[PDB]
C-alpha cells in the first residue's frame, strides 16, 4: 500500500517445466539444490515435478517484479512423513516446504526470506496452518540464515539426513509457528 510488493508467488503450471529444466541443468543452482551429480532431462523434470507423492502438495513459482526466479513445493505432513521429519504426530496442521531460487543474479537479496514470510502468512490465513517445517542441510548457511530471518527456529539436528553430492549431510529441523 506504501511500497510496491516485489516478492510474490503463483501456482506452477505445465508451461513452467521449461524453466525447471533450465534451473536444474544449471551447475550453479545444482550446487545447492539436488546436486551437480543429477543429470536432468525433460523426461525427469516432467516425472519428478508432476508426481503426486503426498496427498496434499502445492507447487509454486517464486516471482520478483513478476519475473519467475525460483520454485517451491509445499505439502501437508501426514502419515509416514511425520517419521521422515522426526516430528511427532499431532492434530495441528503441519506443512513442509522445499524451495530454491534458480536465477543466481537474484541470490543474496533477501528474496528467499521474504518469500518464506509471505508463504507462511498465506498458509496461516488461507490454509489454517499451525506450523511450517523445513529440513535444510546444516552447512547450507545461506538457507538456514534466510529461514531464521523469516522466523524459523532450529528445533533439533537430523544427523545423516540427506545425501548431497556424495556426502551424507546432517540437516536441521526448523519450525515456524503461528
Ligand atoms: Mg526439505
Author numbering: 1 to 178
Authors' description from the paper:
The monofunctional counterpart (AAC(6’)-Im) of the acetyltransferase domain of the bifunctional enzyme has been identified in both Gram-negative and Gram-positive clinical isolates 14. It shares 60% sequence identity and 83% similarity with AAC(6’)-Ie. When expressed in the Escherichia coli JM83 strain, AAC(6’)-Im produces resistance to a wide range of clinically important 4,6-disubstituted aminoglycosides with minimal inhibitory concentration (MIC) values 8 - 128-fold above those for the recipient strain. Here we report the antibiotic susceptibility and kinetic profile and the X-ray structure of the AAC(6’)-Im acetyltransferase in its apo form and as the binary kanamycin A complex, and classify the enzyme as a member of the AAC(6’)-I sub-family C. An analysis of the structural features involved in substrate binding provides insight into the modulation of the activity of these enzymes.
Superposition of the apo-AAC(6’)-Im and AAC(6’)-Im-kanamycin A structures gives an root-mean-square deviation (rmsd) of 0.6 Å. Inspection of the superimposed structures shows that although there are no major differences in the overall structure of the enzyme upon substrate binding, there are some minor rearrangements of the residues inside the kanamycin binding site. A β-hairpin formed by strand β6’ and the N-terminal end of strand β7 moves inward as a rigid body. In addition, small inward or outward movements of side chains which surround the kanamycin molecule are also observed, primarily to facilitate efficient hydrogen bonding and hydrophobic interactions with the substrate.
